Write a protein that binds this ligand. Sequence first.
Ligand SMILES: *[C@@H]1O[C@H](CO)[C@@H](O)[C@H](O)[C@H]1NC(C)=O
Ligand SMILES: *[C@@H]1O[C@H](CO)[C@@H](O)[C@H](O)[C@H]1NC(C)=O
Ligand SMILES: *[C@@H]1O[C@H](CO)[C@@H](O)[C@H](O)[C@H]1NC(C)=O
Ligand SMILES: *[C@@H]1O[C@H](CO)[C@@H](O)[C@H](O)[C@H]1NC(C)=O
Ligand SMILES: *[C@@H]1O[C@H](CO)[C@@H](O)[C@H](O)[C@H]1NC(C)=O
Ligand SMILES: *[C@@H]1O[C@H](CO)[C@@H](O)[C@H](O)[C@H]1NC(C)=O
Ligand SMILES: [Ca+2]
Ligand SMILES: [Ca+2]
Lengths: 301, 144, 241, 46, 64
Amino acid sequence: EDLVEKKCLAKKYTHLSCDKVFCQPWQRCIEGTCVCKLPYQCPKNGTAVCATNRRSFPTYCQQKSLECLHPGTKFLNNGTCTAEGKFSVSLKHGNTDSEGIVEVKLVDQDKTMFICKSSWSMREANVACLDLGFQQGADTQRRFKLSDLSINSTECLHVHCRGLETSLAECTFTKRRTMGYQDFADVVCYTQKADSPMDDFFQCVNGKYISQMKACDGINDCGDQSDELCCKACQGKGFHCKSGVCIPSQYQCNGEVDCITGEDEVGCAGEETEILTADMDAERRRIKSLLPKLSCGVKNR
Amino acid sequence: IQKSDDKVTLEERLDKACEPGVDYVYKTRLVKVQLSNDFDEYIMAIEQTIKSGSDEVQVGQQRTFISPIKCREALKLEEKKHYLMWGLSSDFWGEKPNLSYIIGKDTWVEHWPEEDECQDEENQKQCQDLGAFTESMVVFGCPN
Amino acid sequence: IVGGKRAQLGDLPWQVAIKDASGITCGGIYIGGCWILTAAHCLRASKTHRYQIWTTVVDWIHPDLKRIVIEYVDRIIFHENYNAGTYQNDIALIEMKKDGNKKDCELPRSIPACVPWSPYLFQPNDTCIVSGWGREKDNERVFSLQWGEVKLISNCSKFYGNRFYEKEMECAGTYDGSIDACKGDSGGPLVCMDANNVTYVWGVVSWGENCGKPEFPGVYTKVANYFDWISYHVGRPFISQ
Amino acid sequence: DEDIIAEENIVSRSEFPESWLWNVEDLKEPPKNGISTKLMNIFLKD
Amino acid sequence: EDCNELPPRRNTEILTGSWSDQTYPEGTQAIYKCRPGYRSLGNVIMVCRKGEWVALNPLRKCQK
Ligand SMILES: *[C@@H]1O[C@H](CO)[C@@H](O)[C@H](O)[C@H]1NC(C)=O
Ligand SMILES: *[C@@H]1O[C@H](CO)[C@@H](O)[C@H](O)[C@H]1NC(C)=O
Ligand SMILES: *[C@@H]1O[C@H](CO)[C@@H](O)[C@H](O)[C@H]1NC(C)=O
Ligand SMILES: *[C@@H]1O[C@H](CO)[C@@H](O)[C@H](O)[C@H]1NC(C)=O
Ligand SMILES: *[C@@H]1O[C@H](CO)[C@@H](O)[C@H](O)[C@H]1NC(C)=O
Ligand SMILES: *[C@@H]1O[C@H](CO)[C@@H](O)[C@H](O)[C@H]1NC(C)=O
Ligand SMILES: [Ca+2]
Ligand SMILES: [Ca+2]
C-alpha cells in the first residue's frame, strides 16, 4: 500500500514549512518557511526565563526567539538565573559514547537521577541526543539492552516533551517512586556514516534512516517532522489531516489546532505528580492563545 | 541627518530611531559601490535585522541603496565596511523586482567599526553604544 | 452561475460587486479592512475614480435602500508578471477610500473572508460554492444573484492542455452536473468551507471557455500561490499565520 | 449499578394524543391501471 | 497486541483515566466512557493481559 507520496518528497518539508504544520509562537510564516521573529515581537504576557549564558529574558517567547536567531543559547531554568545552577545530561555505563543509560542533573537539585522506561518515548529521545552533540536525534531501530546491570537506587524522573524542543531543560520533570526499579531508560543516539539503500530506507530530510513501519505512524522519528509531513494514510493509531500529515492520537480534543485544516478538534465533548522546574510546553500553548485573534468567516455578528 | 560629531549618546539613538516615522532599522555591510552619472547605488548585504519593516529579510541577501550624486561627497561610503542604518517607510522605491532604498532626509547613516577596531580606544565609546543599542532594540524595542 | 438559487441578505456575506458606468462588469470579495480581492484582467482600466464598489447587493435594480452600503475606490494594484495571453497571475487588489473622520473601512454587514496560506489546505472532491453576477444559459440575467455548489477537480491539464497551469490556477466543476459558473460572474469568489466552517478564498474567477456544461469546468486563479503577494501589500493581515 | 440503563438515559413516553395525523396528501404518482399509490412515512405516538 | 502503546481509541467511546505513561503491565484494565449522546448498559472495559489488548465486555456497546 502506497502510504508515502512522491510529489511531496521533492520538497522535503520540515517543521519549518508552513505548507504542512503551524509555526511556533516565536516564529512567523514567510514564503512557506517559518523564520525567526525578533524578540520584541513576542507577546509580553508571560514569566521570566534563564538561558545558558546566564542571561535573563522577560518572557519565554523571547528566549526561544533569540535562540532561534543566534543558535546555541539553549534553555536553563524557569525564572531568574542562578549563579551555580547548571543543567547536565550524561550517559553512564555505555560501551561507546553514543549509547548508555540516561542521567539528568537538574538545575534545582544537585543529585543526578535516572529516568523510567515507562515515560520514555521518541519525543524525548531525539531532544535528548540534540543537546548531547547528535544533530540527527536518536536512532529508532537500535536499542541498548543492559549487561544485567545492578541498580541501587529507586528514584526516577518521569519525563514528557513535545518533540521539537532543543534541550531537556524545557520539558516537564516529575519525580516518582518505583519499587525494585525494573524501569530502566536506555538510548541509542544515531550514528552517522552515509550508506547505500536496500533496507527500506525511508530517508529523513536531516538524513537519518529508519524502517518502513516507523514513518507515517504519528511519531516524529526523524526529529524534524520529516516522516510525518508526507503521508496519504497513517500506519498505526495516528490521525490523518486533509493536508497529509499524521499526528499522535492524544492530539485530538487537546485544546490546540494541530492540522492546518483543523479537523482534529471538531466535535470534541471529551494527577498527584509534583513540581520540578515548571513545564514550558504548556507555556507554548498559552502563548499561541495570545496570538492575533479577530473575526474571519464568522456566521454571527 | 549628519547628527554626528555632537553629543551622540545612547538615549539619542534610542529616541531618534524609535520615532513612528522610522519603519526599519538594519545593520548593513557595503559590498559594492557602482558610481554613476545619474544615481549612486550602494549594494549592501543586511547582516543583522535590528528592526524589520515592509521588506522581509533573508540575512545573506543584498539590497541596493540609491542616493543622488550630490550626496556622495558628504559621506564617503567605502566597500567592505559596516554601517548602522535606519529609515522611514516613505524611503521605499520600486514595486519589488527592483526595490531600492533611498538615503533620504530622515535616513540615519553611521559608520560601524570592525571587530578588531573595537579593541582600539578611539572607537571604544561608539562600539559600546552601538552594541547596547542593537540588544535593547531587539529584545525590548520602542515603547508602544 | 447557471443553476442556483437567489441569494438573500444573510447568505454569502463576502460577496462584493463592482459596477462601472456601463452596467456591472465583474465582482470581487472582501477580505477585511479596506482591501478587495478581484481578477486583474477585469479591472485593468486605471480609471480608478469612476469605479464603484457595492456590498450586500442582494437583488439588483431594486435593493434594500437601508444596508446597501457602497464605498469608493482609492487605489488599484495589479499583478506585475500578469500575462494577457495565458491569463497567468490574474489577481488584483482594491483599496477602498474612507473619510478622514473614521480611519479604515467600517463595514458592519458583509463579513470578511480568510486567505489560504498553503496549496494543501483544500483538495479535490470538496464542496465549494461559486457565487456572482453571472449568466444562466446565455441570458443577460445579471439582475439576480445566483449561487451554487461546485466541486474541485484534480489534474485539469487533461481538459485544457497547454492553457492550464497547476501552480497558479485551479479548476472547479461538477461531474455529470451542468452547474458551472460562466461569463458574467467573473472575478467572483470560489469559497470552500473547512471542518470548522471557516470561509476561505481558494480562488477567484480568472478565465474559462464559453460555459459548456461538465465538459469544460471553470478555471480560477489559485489564491494560495499568491499568499505572499497579498500579505506584502496589506501588512500581515487578519488571518493567523 | 451494573447491567442496567441509567435514569438520565431513559426518555419517558409523553405523546398520548386522542387523535392525530390530521394531514393532507395528494395522489400525484404515475397511475397504474388508474390507481396511484403513495407511500407515506409517519412517526407513531407513545 | 503489544502493550507498549495507549489503548485503541474507540470510535464512539472515550477513556476515563489519566494515562500519563506509555507501557503498561499486568491486566491494566482500560474503562471506556460512553461519549455524550450515547447510551449503554455500563462501562465498556478493555484489558491488557500480557500479549494483547482484549475486550472484557463484547456484547456491551454504546448505541445512539
Ligand atoms: C497575563 O495575563 C493577562 C493578559 O493575558 C494580564 O492582564 C495579566 O496581568 C498577566 N498575568 C499576570 C500574573 O500578571
Ligand atoms: C515558572 O513558570 C511557570 C510558567 O511560565 C509560572 O506559572 C510559574 O509562576 C513560574 N515560577 C516562578 C517561581 O516564577
Ligand atoms: C542501595 O543503596 C542504599 C544507600 O547506599 C542502601 O541503603 C541499600 O541497602 C542499597 N540496596 C542494595 C540492594 O544494595
Ligand atoms: C472522489 O474522487 C474519486 C476519484 O478521485 C471519485 O471516483 C469519487 O466519485 C469522488 N467522490 C466524491 C464524493 O466526490
Ligand atoms: C493527468 O493529466 C495528463 C495530462 O497532462 C494526462 O496525460 C494523464 O493521463 C492524467 N492522469 C491520469 C491519471 O489520467
Ligand atoms: C459546519 O457545522 C455544521 C454542524 O452544525 C455541519 O454542517 C458541519 O459539521 C460543518 N460544515 C462543513 C461543511 O464541514
Ligand atoms: Ca513516524
Ligand atoms: Ca489538537
